[PDB]
């Protein structure tokens, strides 16, 4: 219990089955997973202590946290992934489903909104029927990259009187963001009104996604044949850029950096090239992955994953490091017995040429395991160290 929010007050709902059930948007303040996590419930006994729980520490109150003057709860996982999907220019809904998606909003005024498209076929937009969950008087404006008032890319966000005019709804809008749709709905309409909105957004989006569906497979790690050719080449040219420096230093022509050994200088350049390399290779896959790429789709909504995840799985894992430096000669002048002595090559000092899709070599596998283990230890050590820091 590191937070004010690691203990919040909830409304009981007696249910069947042996698990405590919680709303997914309250997952974040608790720092709970369903990876088998258990939680404690404490029942107050005084009319007075209940009042304390309800009036001071109930979930809706705890929504906008004073830790960062921003909300500590937002839309997550399925609902975050599906909200981007629903709120696209391309996404349209036929009447049959519009009527179900309306009914699902428990507050819904009973008014069927006039469809964005009328004459060819009555079709509603994602944006449209999601704005049924957004309350009146909610006014938000945000500009991304190159968003204009005629938002060409479906960039930014423009909600007027609680109606989406333009922009895809993703992490920056419906997340636990500083200028959030949540941050605004709380400050403007009440913590209660806001807690309702969590549910409403969920109920709609979740329903729409239940029927649209979402998946991921090995196909989503697979990058284009020519894009792979381009990566293999990028890695190759970087390896040569490394050798050129390796021979330059062996010929005593390499001049040391101010306040750095010739060795310190050489190693700096090497690891800088081999990183520049991993980054470029990854950026090639990232660009080449279509908008239909399920990994890209999760990265886009902001639901899960980032560039490095794509980079490592699809293109190149990159240089492995322990104690700030490339795998050191644990053996006399060699990283493994499988190499010759005084081998400073990318291959010897732990650069993982391969992607996760391609699979690591035995050497790559071990050097990865070496750096990997350093992670697990450092984590273990930090969990301890931070524990005491919090208490003191």
């Amino acid at each position: 219990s590191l937070h004010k929010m690691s203990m919040m007050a909830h409304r009981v709902k007696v249910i069947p089955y042996s698990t405590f059930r919680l709303n997914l948007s309250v997952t974040s303040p608790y720092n709970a997973d369903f990876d088998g996590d258990e939680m404690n419930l404490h029942v107050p006994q005084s009319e007075e202590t209940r009042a304390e729980l309800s009036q001071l520490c109930a979930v809706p109150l705890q929504i906008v946290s004073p830790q960062s003057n921003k909300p500590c709860m937002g839309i997550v996982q399925d609902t975050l992934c599906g909200i981007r999907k629903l709120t696209l220019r391309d996404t349209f809904i036929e009447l049959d489903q519009v009527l179900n998606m309306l009914y699902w909003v428990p507050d819904w005024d009973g008014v069927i909104p006039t469809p964005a498209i009328i004459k060819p076929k009555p079709l509603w937009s994602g944006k449209q029927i999601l704005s049924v969950a957004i309350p009146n008087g909610i006014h938000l404006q945000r500009f991304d990259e190159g968003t204009t008032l005629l938002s060409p890319k479906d960039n930014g966000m423009l909600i007027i009187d609680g109606q989406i005019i333009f922009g895809v709804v993703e992490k920056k809008t419906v997340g636990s963001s500083n200028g959030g749709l949540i941050h605004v709905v709380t400050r403007e309409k009440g913590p209660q009104v806001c807690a309702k909105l969590f549910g409403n957004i969920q109920k709609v989006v979740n329903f729409w996604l239940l029927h649209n569906g979402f998946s991921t497979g090995i196909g989503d790690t697979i990058a284009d044949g020519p894009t792979m050719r381009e990566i293999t080449e990028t890695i190759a040219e970087a390896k040569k850029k490394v050798l050129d420096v390796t021979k330059e230093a062996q010929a005593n022509l390499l001049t040391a950096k101010h306040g750095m050994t010739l060795r310190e200088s050489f190693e700096d350049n090497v690891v800088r090239f081999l990183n520049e390399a991993r980054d470029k290779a990854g950026r090639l896959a990232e660009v080449n992955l279509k908008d239909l790429n399920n990994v890209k789709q999760m990265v886009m909504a902001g639901s899960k994953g980032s560039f490095i995840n794509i980079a490592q799985m699809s293109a190149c894992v990159g240089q492995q490091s322990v104690e700030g430096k490339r795998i050191a000669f644990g053996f006399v002048d060699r990283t493994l017995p499988h190499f010759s002595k005084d081998d400073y090559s990318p291959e010897s000092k732990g650069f993982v040429e391969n992607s996760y899709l391609r699979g690591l070599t035995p050497q790559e596998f071990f050097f990865h395991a070496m750096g990997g283990r350093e992670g697990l230890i450092d984590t273990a050590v930090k969990t301890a160290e931070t524990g005491y820091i919090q208490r003191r």
Binding site: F34, D78, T216, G217
Partner: protein, 147 residues
Amino acid sequence: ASRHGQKGTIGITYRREDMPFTAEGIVPDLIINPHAIPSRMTVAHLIECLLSKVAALSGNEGDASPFTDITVEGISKLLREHGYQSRGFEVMYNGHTGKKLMAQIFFGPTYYQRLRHMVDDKIHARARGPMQVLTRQPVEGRSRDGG
């Protein structure tokens, strides 16, 4: 949990008719989240599944051995020879409506293990009970009727 550090508990149990399905009539035994893959980078889980599908269809015992000459493009060629979309996706229909999901699901067999922590062995509640002799405070543990 799968053999890829992919642990998890059940949320709900759905019967065959509520479950999504292949036009073939096949239905999943498990539904794991797409989100549990990018952050984790358990590519081998995906490959396990691709190879396992081929193995079941062909009456083989797929080689998931580490430093092999086996590739995803190789396995895929075999799966398409068996009449399936090479990368394991399959067109699925929603159980409630019968309507095709706009999405194609990565459907295939995967070896899951039953782990030793059952909920009904963990669940615990107390509202007054045994107290320690010395401290006169609640005792410890589910077994001991602890607080």
